[PDB]
Amino acid sequence: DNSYKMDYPEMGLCIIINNKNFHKSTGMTSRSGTDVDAANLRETFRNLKYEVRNKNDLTREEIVELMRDVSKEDHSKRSSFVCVLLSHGEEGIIFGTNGPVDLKKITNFFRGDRCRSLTGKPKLFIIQACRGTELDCGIET
Amino acid sequence: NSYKMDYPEMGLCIIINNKNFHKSTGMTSRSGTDVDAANLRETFRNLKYEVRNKNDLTREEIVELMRDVSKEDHSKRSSFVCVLLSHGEEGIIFGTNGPVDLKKITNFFRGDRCRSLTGKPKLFIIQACRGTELDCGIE
Amino acid sequence: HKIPVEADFLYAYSTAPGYYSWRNSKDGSWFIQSLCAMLKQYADKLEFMHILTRVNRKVATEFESFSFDATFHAKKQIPCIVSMLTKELYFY
Amino acid sequence: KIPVEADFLYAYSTAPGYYSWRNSKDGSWFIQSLCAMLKQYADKLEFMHILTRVNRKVATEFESFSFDATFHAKKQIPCIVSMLTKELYFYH
Amino acid sequence: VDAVD
Amino acid sequence: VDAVD
């Protein structure tokens, strides 16, 4: 079998976490432009027949609870799972509105042994976030 | 759209095969790796790469080699391949006498530091641990 | 008949490890702009990895930062596809 | 200009944080699979799809055998990291 | 106009 | 014999 089975009754969920406004105590800037991203993604995955759920400005606690809950849903009749994270970040880390959370903590809920109704199904994480503070100066060619 | 792979040469395939480590490392001999290096040499030979096998290099010899390769003229080559077979940690490969940041190896070939490979595929194949977790699998 | 518990994940990162990722205040992030455009054009035709490779090329070639701060001006970005997938993925 | 990190591909034998497995007689699981898939498919498939077959072969056809229960019956998934901007074919 | 994440 | 790297 060389291609994932994509003809289940449902394509699956597309969870979009759009963090624009951060607690001033974090020092993080407002992410102007992310609402445009979030609406673009909703329309894009809608036309791919995903059940899209947009969540806005979640704390690190709400991110973990959302992911936990979604991973415990019954995905048996779904082909795949998509999660889009739009926020600030560092290497290995995505920011809730009030502080950091390890990406590995989020993706671990969907591990093959921990979300059995997604075992063998593609689990797609799309991450718009910084991964550090290096800048690519590019090369002219 | 696809890379131009009809340059006169497919390019180099560097194979660094580290089997025996200095006792200061506390790291066991990597039985089976000679089979790997010989398999890779034949595989890439059939793909028309110029293969160079090197064996049991220190961390300094790895850095040196990569620097020298990176300063060669790759103008007539379609691509570059480097295969690293050794012990490792996350972000790290081991020379015979100690660890080396993988970023220090790959940086020699950045588009601004190896101009004759700008725009061409640079493939690094890494057989080495990346930590000490074990995957218990799921039925 | 077991599979790795880490199998069948794909992480489509907007940028390389260690780097900033860029966002336009009016049009959105370079990466998401490009991803949505290529899914729209190619999801009925191309495998997902080839779609994401086209996203890489679009981000790498069509975007360059504009900033009043010279430190942040004229910068570039390459996304980073991380696949632990075991099969090809077609959205149709 | 293009990014200086563009046009790299890192084919890792195992996922971030994990051990990678080797057989003392047959070689490492990943290299065995990589050479076999390149032999079978280099004249047929794009490189990312070849590596996806390598992922499936490592994930499904290998499981560790160890006298130490701690290291017995373990699995592995390779990790493809692509900053490539184009498809890569080893054939004409 | 352009900002970092 | 299976071993880790």
Coordinates of C-alpha atoms in Angstrom, one line a residue:
Chain A
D1 CA 0.0 0.0 0.0
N2 CA 1.8 3.1 -1.3
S3 CA -0.9 5.8 -0.7
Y4 CA -2.9 6.6 2.4
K5 CA -6.6 5.7 2.3
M6 CA -8.4 9.0 1.8
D7 CA -11.9 7.7 1.1
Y8 CA -13.1 7.3 4.6
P9 CA -16.5 9.0 5.2
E10 CA -14.8 12.2 6.3
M11 CA -11.5 13.8 5.3
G12 CA -11.0 14.7 9.0
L13 CA -10.6 17.6 11.3
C14 CA -8.6 20.8 10.6
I15 CA -7.9 22.5 13.9
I16 CA -6.6 26.1 13.4
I17 CA -5.1 27.8 16.5
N18 CA -4.7 31.5 15.7
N19 CA -2.9 33.5 18.4
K20 CA -2.8 37.2 17.6
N21 CA -2.9 39.0 20.9
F22 CA -0.5 38.1 23.7
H23 CA -0.5 39.0 27.4
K24 CA 1.6 42.1 27.7
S25 CA 3.5 40.4 30.6
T26 CA 5.1 38.1 27.9
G27 CA 6.6 40.9 26.0
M28 CA 5.4 39.5 22.7
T29 CA 4.1 41.6 19.9
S30 CA 0.7 41.5 18.3
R31 CA 0.8 39.3 15.2
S32 CA -0.8 41.6 12.6
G33 CA -1.7 39.6 9.5
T34 CA -2.6 36.3 11.2
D35 CA -6.3 36.8 10.8
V36 CA -5.8 36.9 7.1
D37 CA -3.9 33.6 7.4
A38 CA -6.6 32.0 9.5
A39 CA -9.3 32.9 7.1
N40 CA -7.2 31.7 4.1
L41 CA -6.6 28.4 5.8
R42 CA -10.3 27.9 6.7
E43 CA -11.4 28.5 3.1
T44 CA -8.6 26.3 1.8
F45 CA -9.3 23.3 4.0
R46 CA -13.1 23.8 3.6
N47 CA -12.6 23.2 -0.2
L48 CA -10.6 20.1 0.7
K49 CA -13.7 18.8 2.7
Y50 CA -12.1 19.1 6.1
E51 CA -14.2 19.9 9.1
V52 CA -12.5 23.2 10.1
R53 CA -12.5 24.4 13.7
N54 CA -10.9 27.9 14.3
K55 CA -9.8 28.7 17.8
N56 CA -8.4 32.2 18.6
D57 CA -6.0 33.6 21.3
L58 CA -5.6 30.4 23.4
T59 CA -3.5 30.2 26.6
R60 CA -0.9 27.5 26.8
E61 CA -3.4 25.7 29.1
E62 CA -6.2 26.0 26.6
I63 CA -4.0 24.7 23.8
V64 CA -3.1 21.6 25.8
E65 CA -6.7 21.0 26.8
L66 CA -8.0 21.4 23.3
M67 CA -5.4 19.0 21.9
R68 CA -6.1 16.5 24.6
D69 CA -9.8 16.6 24.0
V70 CA -9.5 16.4 20.2
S71 CA -7.1 13.4 20.5
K72 CA -9.8 11.6 22.5
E73 CA -12.5 12.1 19.9
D74 CA -13.5 9.1 17.8
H75 CA -11.7 9.6 14.5
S76 CA -12.5 6.1 13.2
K77 CA -14.5 7.5 10.2
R78 CA -12.0 10.2 9.4
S79 CA -9.1 9.8 6.9
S80 CA -6.6 12.1 8.4
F81 CA -6.0 14.9 10.9
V82 CA -4.7 18.4 10.4
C83 CA -3.5 20.9 13.0
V84 CA -2.4 24.5 12.1
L85 CA -0.5 26.6 14.7
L86 CA -0.2 30.3 14.1
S87 CA 1.8 32.0 16.8
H88 CA 5.2 33.2 18.1
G89 CA 7.7 30.4 18.8
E90 CA 11.2 29.2 19.5
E91 CA 12.9 26.0 18.5
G92 CA 10.7 23.2 19.7
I93 CA 8.2 25.7 21.2
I94 CA 4.9 27.4 20.3
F95 CA 3.5 30.2 22.4
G96 CA 0.1 30.4 24.0
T97 CA -1.1 33.9 24.8
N98 CA 0.5 33.6 28.2
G99 CA 3.6 31.5 27.7
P100 CA 5.4 28.7 26.0
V101 CA 4.5 25.1 25.4
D102 CA 6.7 22.4 24.0
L103 CA 5.5 21.3 20.5
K104 CA 6.3 17.7 21.5
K105 CA 3.7 17.9 24.3
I106 CA 1.1 18.8 21.7
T107 CA 2.0 16.2 19.1
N108 CA 2.4 13.4 21.7
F109 CA -1.4 13.3 22.2
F110 CA -1.7 11.9 18.6
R111 CA 1.0 9.3 18.9
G112 CA 0.1 6.0 17.3
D113 CA -0.3 4.3 20.7
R114 CA -2.2 7.2 22.3
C115 CA -4.8 8.0 19.6
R116 CA -5.8 4.6 18.2
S117 CA -8.5 5.9 15.9
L118 CA -5.7 7.7 14.0
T119 CA -3.2 4.9 14.0
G120 CA -1.9 4.4 10.4
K121 CA -3.6 7.7 9.3
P122 CA -1.6 10.8 8.3
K123 CA -1.3 13.4 11.1
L124 CA -0.3 16.8 9.6
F125 CA 1.0 19.7 11.7
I126 CA 1.4 23.0 9.9
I127 CA 3.5 25.4 12.1
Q128 CA 3.8 29.2 11.3
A129 CA 6.1 30.3 14.1
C130 CA 9.6 31.4 14.7
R131 CA 12.2 28.7 15.5
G132 CA 14.9 30.9 16.9
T133 CA 16.4 34.3 16.1
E134 CA 18.6 33.7 13.1
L135 CA 18.2 35.7 9.9
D136 CA 18.9 34.3 6.4
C137 CA 20.7 37.0 4.4
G138 CA 20.3 35.1 1.2
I139 CA 22.7 34.7 -1.7
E140 CA 22.3 36.4 -5.1
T141 CA 22.0 33.8 -7.9
Chain B
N1 CA 9.6 21.8 -11.6
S2 CA 12.8 19.7 -11.1
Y3 CA 16.5 20.1 -10.6
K4 CA 18.8 20.1 -13.5
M5 CA 20.6 16.7 -13.3
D6 CA 22.2 16.7 -16.8
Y7 CA 25.4 18.5 -15.8
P8 CA 28.5 16.5 -17.0
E9 CA 28.8 14.8 -13.6
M10 CA 26.1 13.8 -11.1
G11 CA 28.5 14.9 -8.4
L12 CA 30.4 13.7 -5.4
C13 CA 29.1 11.2 -2.8
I14 CA 31.2 11.4 0.3
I15 CA 30.9 8.5 2.7
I16 CA 32.3 8.9 6.2
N17 CA 32.3 5.5 7.8
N18 CA 33.2 5.5 11.5
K19 CA 33.5 2.1 13.1
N20 CA 36.2 2.2 15.8
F21 CA 36.2 4.9 18.5
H22 CA 38.9 5.9 20.9
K23 CA 38.4 4.4 24.4
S24 CA 38.1 7.9 25.8
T25 CA 34.7 8.0 24.1
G26 CA 33.3 5.0 25.9
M27 CA 31.6 4.0 22.6
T28 CA 31.4 0.6 21.2
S29 CA 32.5 -0.7 17.8
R30 CA 29.8 -0.3 15.2
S31 CA 29.6 -3.8 13.7
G32 CA 27.7 -3.9 10.4
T33 CA 28.8 -0.4 9.3
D34 CA 31.3 -1.8 6.8
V35 CA 28.4 -3.6 5.1
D36 CA 26.5 -0.2 5.0
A37 CA 29.4 1.7 3.4
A38 CA 30.0 -1.0 0.8
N39 CA 26.2 -1.0 0.0
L40 CA 26.2 2.8 -0.4
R41 CA 29.3 2.8 -2.5
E42 CA 27.7 0.4 -5.0
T43 CA 24.3 2.1 -4.9
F44 CA 25.6 5.5 -5.7
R45 CA 28.0 4.1 -8.3
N46 CA 25.0 2.9 -10.2
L47 CA 23.6 6.4 -10.0
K48 CA 26.8 7.7 -11.6
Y49 CA 28.2 9.6 -8.5
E50 CA 31.9 9.9 -7.9
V51 CA 32.1 8.0 -4.6
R52 CA 34.8 8.7 -1.9
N53 CA 34.8 6.4 1.1
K54 CA 36.7 7.5 4.1
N55 CA 37.0 5.4 7.3
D56 CA 37.5 6.2 11.0
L57 CA 38.0 10.0 11.0
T58 CA 38.4 12.2 14.0
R59 CA 36.2 15.2 14.5
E60 CA 39.0 17.4 13.2
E61 CA 39.5 15.2 10.1
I62 CA 35.7 15.4 9.4
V63 CA 35.7 19.2 9.6
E64 CA 38.9 19.4 7.5
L65 CA 37.5 17.0 4.8
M66 CA 34.2 18.9 4.6
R67 CA 36.0 22.2 4.3
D68 CA 38.2 20.9 1.5
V69 CA 35.3 19.3 -0.4
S70 CA 33.3 22.6 0.0
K71 CA 36.2 24.5 -1.6
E72 CA 36.3 22.3 -4.7
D73 CA 34.9 23.4 -8.0
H74 CA 31.4 21.8 -8.3
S75 CA 30.5 23.8 -11.4
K76 CA 30.1 20.7 -13.6
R77 CA 28.3 18.6 -11.0
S78 CA 24.6 18.3 -10.6
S79 CA 24.4 17.7 -6.9
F80 CA 26.3 16.8 -3.7
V81 CA 25.7 13.8 -1.4
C82 CA 27.3 13.3 2.0
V83 CA 26.6 10.1 4.0
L84 CA 27.6 10.0 7.7
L85 CA 27.7 6.6 9.5
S86 CA 28.6 6.9 13.2
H87 CA 27.3 7.4 16.7
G88 CA 25.3 10.5 17.3
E89 CA 23.2 12.7 19.6
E90 CA 20.5 15.2 18.6
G91 CA 22.3 17.6 16.3
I92 CA 25.6 15.8 16.7
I93 CA 27.7 13.2 14.9
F94 CA 30.8 11.6 16.5
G95 CA 34.2 11.5 15.1
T96 CA 36.4 8.8 16.4
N97 CA 37.6 11.0 19.2
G98 CA 34.5 13.1 20.0
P99 CA 31.3 14.8 18.9
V100 CA 30.9 17.4 16.1
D101 CA 27.9 19.7 15.5
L102 CA 26.1 18.6 12.3
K103 CA 25.5 22.3 11.6
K104 CA 29.2 22.9 11.4
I105 CA 29.5 20.2 8.7
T106 CA 26.5 21.4 6.6
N107 CA 27.4 25.1 6.9
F108 CA 30.3 24.7 4.6
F109 CA 27.8 24.1 1.8
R110 CA 25.5 27.0 2.5
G111 CA 24.5 28.8 -0.7
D112 CA 26.7 31.8 0.2
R113 CA 29.7 29.7 1.2
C114 CA 29.8 27.1 -1.6
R115 CA 28.9 29.1 -4.7
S116 CA 29.4 26.3 -7.2
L117 CA 26.6 24.4 -5.5
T118 CA 24.2 27.3 -5.2
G119 CA 20.8 26.2 -6.5
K120 CA 21.8 22.5 -6.6
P121 CA 20.6 19.8 -4.2
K122 CA 22.8 19.1 -1.3
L123 CA 21.8 15.7 0.3
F124 CA 23.0 14.7 3.8
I125 CA 22.2 11.1 4.8
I126 CA 22.7 10.4 8.5
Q127 CA 22.8 7.0 10.1
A128 CA 23.4 7.9 13.8
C129 CA 21.3 8.1 17.0
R130 CA 19.6 11.3 17.8
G131 CA 19.1 10.7 21.5
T132 CA 18.3 7.7 23.7
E133 CA 14.5 7.2 23.4
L134 CA 13.1 3.9 22.3
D135 CA 9.9 3.5 20.2
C136 CA 7.9 0.6 21.6
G137 CA 5.5 0.6 18.6
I138 CA 1.8 -0.1 18.5
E139 CA 0.0 -3.2 17.2
Chain C
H1 CA 2.7 -6.4 13.0
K2 CA 3.6 -3.2 14.8
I3 CA 4.3 0.3 13.6
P4 CA 6.4 3.0 15.2
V5 CA 4.3 5.3 17.5
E6 CA 6.1 8.3 15.8
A7 CA 5.2 7.1 12.3
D8 CA 2.7 8.8 10.0
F9 CA 3.4 12.4 11.2
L10 CA 4.3 15.3 9.0
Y11 CA 5.4 18.6 10.4
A12 CA 5.3 21.4 7.8
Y13 CA 7.4 24.1 9.4
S14 CA 7.3 27.6 8.0
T15 CA 11.1 28.1 8.5
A16 CA 14.4 26.3 9.0
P17 CA 15.5 25.2 12.5
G18 CA 16.9 28.1 14.5
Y19 CA 15.5 30.9 12.2
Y20 CA 12.9 33.6 12.4
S21 CA 9.7 33.2 10.3
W22 CA 8.3 36.2 8.4
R23 CA 4.8 37.6 8.3
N24 CA 3.3 40.5 6.3
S25 CA 1.0 42.7 8.3
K26 CA -1.5 43.0 5.5
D27 CA -1.2 39.7 3.5
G28 CA -0.3 37.2 6.2
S29 CA 2.7 35.0 6.7
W30 CA 4.7 34.2 3.7
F31 CA 4.4 30.5 4.4
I32 CA 0.7 30.3 4.9
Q33 CA 0.1 32.6 1.9
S34 CA 2.1 30.2 -0.2
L35 CA 0.7 27.0 1.2
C36 CA -2.9 28.0 0.6
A37 CA -2.0 29.1 -2.9
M38 CA -0.4 25.8 -3.8
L39 CA -3.0 23.7 -2.2
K40 CA -5.6 25.7 -4.2
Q41 CA -3.7 25.2 -7.5
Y42 CA -2.4 21.6 -7.0
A43 CA -4.3 19.6 -4.4
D44 CA -6.4 17.9 -7.1
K45 CA -3.3 16.8 -9.0
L46 CA 0.0 16.6 -6.9
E47 CA 1.1 14.5 -4.0
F48 CA 1.4 16.5 -0.8
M49 CA 5.2 16.4 -0.6
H50 CA 5.4 17.8 -4.1
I51 CA 2.9 20.5 -3.1
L52 CA 5.1 21.4 -0.1
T53 CA 8.2 21.5 -2.3
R54 CA 6.4 24.0 -4.5
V55 CA 5.7 26.0 -1.3
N56 CA 9.4 25.9 -0.5
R57 CA 10.3 27.3 -3.9
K58 CA 7.6 30.0 -3.7
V59 CA 8.7 31.2 -0.3
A60 CA 12.4 31.0 -1.2
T61 CA 12.1 33.0 -4.5
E62 CA 9.0 35.3 -4.3
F63 CA 9.5 36.9 -0.9
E64 CA 12.1 39.2 0.6
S65 CA 11.7 41.2 3.8
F66 CA 11.2 45.0 3.7
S67 CA 12.0 46.7 6.9
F68 CA 12.8 50.2 8.1
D69 CA 15.2 48.6 10.5
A70 CA 18.3 47.8 8.3
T71 CA 19.0 44.8 10.6
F72 CA 15.8 43.1 9.5
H73 CA 15.8 44.3 5.8
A74 CA 16.3 42.1 2.7
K75 CA 16.0 38.8 4.5
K76 CA 15.0 35.5 3.1
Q77 CA 13.2 32.3 4.3
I78 CA 13.1 28.6 3.4
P79 CA 10.3 26.4 5.0
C80 CA 11.2 23.0 6.4
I81 CA 9.3 19.8 5.6
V82 CA 9.7 17.1 8.2
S83 CA 8.0 13.8 7.1
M84 CA 7.6 10.7 9.1
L85 CA 5.0 9.6 6.6
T86 CA 5.0 6.1 5.4
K87 CA 2.8 6.5 2.3
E88 CA 2.0 9.1 -0.4
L89 CA -0.8 11.6 0.4
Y90 CA -3.3 12.7 -2.2
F91 CA -6.2 15.0 -1.1
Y92 CA -8.6 13.5 -3.6
Chain D
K1 CA 18.4 36.0 -4.1
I2 CA 17.6 32.6 -2.6
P3 CA 17.9 31.6 1.1
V4 CA 21.4 30.3 2.0
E5 CA 19.6 27.3 3.8
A6 CA 17.7 26.4 0.6
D7 CA 18.3 23.2 -1.4
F8 CA 19.4 21.0 1.5
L9 CA 17.8 17.7 2.2
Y10 CA 18.7 15.8 5.5
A11 CA 17.6 12.1 5.4
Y12 CA 17.9 11.1 9.0
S13 CA 17.7 7.4 10.0
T14 CA 15.5 8.1 13.0
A15 CA 13.2 10.6 14.6
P16 CA 14.5 13.4 16.8
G17 CA 15.4 12.2 20.2
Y18 CA 15.5 8.5 19.4
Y19 CA 18.0 5.7 19.0
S20 CA 18.8 4.4 15.5
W21 CA 19.2 0.6 15.0
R22 CA 21.9 -1.4 13.3
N23 CA 22.3 -5.1 12.6
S24 CA 25.9 -6.4 13.1
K25 CA 25.7 -8.5 10.0
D26 CA 23.3 -6.8 7.6
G27 CA 24.0 -3.1 8.4
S28 CA 21.8 -0.4 9.7
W29 CA 18.1 -0.7 9.1
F30 CA 17.9 2.7 7.4
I31 CA 20.9 2.2 5.0
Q32 CA 19.7 -1.3 4.0
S33 CA 16.3 0.1 3.2
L34 CA 17.7 3.2 1.5
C35 CA 20.0 1.2 -0.8
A36 CA 17.2 -1.3 -1.6
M37 CA 14.7 1.4 -2.5
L38 CA 17.2 3.4 -4.6
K39 CA 18.0 0.2 -6.5
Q40 CA 14.4 -0.6 -7.0
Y41 CA 13.0 2.9 -7.7
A42 CA 15.7 5.4 -8.7
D43 CA 14.7 5.0 -12.4
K44 CA 10.9 5.3 -11.5
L45 CA 10.2 7.7 -8.6
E46 CA 11.0 11.2 -7.4
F47 CA 13.5 11.2 -4.5
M48 CA 11.0 12.3 -1.8
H49 CA 8.8 9.4 -2.8
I50 CA 11.7 7.0 -2.7
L51 CA 12.4 8.2 0.8
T52 CA 8.8 7.7 1.7
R53 CA 9.1 4.0 0.7
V54 CA 12.3 3.9 2.9
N55 CA 10.2 5.2 5.8
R56 CA 7.6 2.5 5.2
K57 CA 10.1 -0.3 4.8
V58 CA 12.0 0.6 8.0
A59 CA 8.7 1.1 9.9
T60 CA 7.1 -2.2 8.9
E61 CA 9.8 -4.7 8.1
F62 CA 12.1 -4.2 11.1
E63 CA 11.8 -4.9 14.8
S64 CA 14.6 -5.2 17.3
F65 CA 15.7 -8.6 18.7
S66 CA 17.6 -8.3 21.9
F67 CA 18.5 -10.5 24.8
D68 CA 18.0 -7.4 27.0
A69 CA 14.3 -7.0 27.4
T70 CA 14.8 -3.2 27.7
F71 CA 16.0 -3.1 24.1
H72 CA 13.7 -5.9 22.7
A73 CA 10.9 -5.5 20.2
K74 CA 11.6 -1.8 19.4
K75 CA 10.7 0.1 16.2
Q76 CA 12.1 2.9 14.2
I77 CA 10.8 5.6 11.8
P78 CA 13.3 7.6 9.7
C79 CA 12.9 11.4 9.5
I80 CA 13.0 13.2 6.1
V81 CA 13.9 16.9 6.4
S82 CA 13.6 18.8 3.1
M83 CA 14.6 22.3 2.4
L84 CA 14.6 21.4 -1.3
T85 CA 12.9 23.8 -3.8
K86 CA 12.5 21.3 -6.7
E87 CA 11.7 17.7 -7.4
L88 CA 14.8 15.4 -7.7
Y89 CA 15.0 12.6 -10.2
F90 CA 18.0 10.4 -10.7
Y91 CA 16.9 9.5 -14.2
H92 CA 16.7 11.5 -17.4
Chain E
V1 CA 4.9 45.9 6.9
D2 CA 7.0 42.7 7.3
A3 CA 7.4 41.4 10.9
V4 CA 9.0 38.3 12.5
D5 CA 7.2 35.4 14.4
Chain F
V1 CA 22.6 -9.0 16.4
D2 CA 20.7 -5.7 16.8
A3 CA 22.5 -2.7 18.3
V4 CA 21.9 1.0 18.8
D5 CA 23.9 3.9 17.2

